[PDB]
Amino acid sequence: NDDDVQKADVSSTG
Amino acid sequence: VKFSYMWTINNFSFCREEMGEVIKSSTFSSGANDKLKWCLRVNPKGLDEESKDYLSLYLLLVSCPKSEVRAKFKFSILNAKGEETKAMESQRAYRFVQGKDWGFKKFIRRDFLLDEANGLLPDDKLTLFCEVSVV
């Protein structure tokens, strides 16, 4: 499952 | 130019915020002449359905004197042992404009944060650190 404790992907909420 | 900020959210286990709802920090600055103002925004129950199992954490540019700011940033959590843990950094500088944020939609899983074995909510407080570096 894609249930890592954190994900390092950076994004913006807009 | 470096910025550092520590944000303590009291009574964090009792946040009423539902998915998509946000808590915003006070602003912080370099103390120098650059006039930049920043703040943090957290979604305790995630930004959206995709991230509902996570706390979402973002750096917001509140004010800048010209049009755009390039900045690197790092967020971490204070644990019960008095140490910074779970730190994540932007791998490069991102382009900020006033009112724009950048950060981590999946900063840390709620079920990890709420597991007392990890010590991330001592006295039910969530303490976040932010380091910002501006060219």
Residue numbers in the entry:
A (entry chain B): 91 to 104
B (entry chain A): 30 to 164
Show sentences the authors wrote.
The adaptor protein, speckle-type BTB/POZ protein (SPOP), recruits substrates to the cullin-3-subclass of E3 ligase for selective protein ubiquitylation. SPOP recruits substrates via its N-terminal MATH domain, whereas a central BTB domain mediates dimerization and interactions with Cul3. Here, we show that MyD88 interacts with SPOP through a long degron that contains the established SPOP-binding consensus and an N-terminal site that we name the Q-motif. We determine the structural basis of these interactions and show that the Q-motif interacts with an unexplored binding pocket on the SPOP MATH domain.
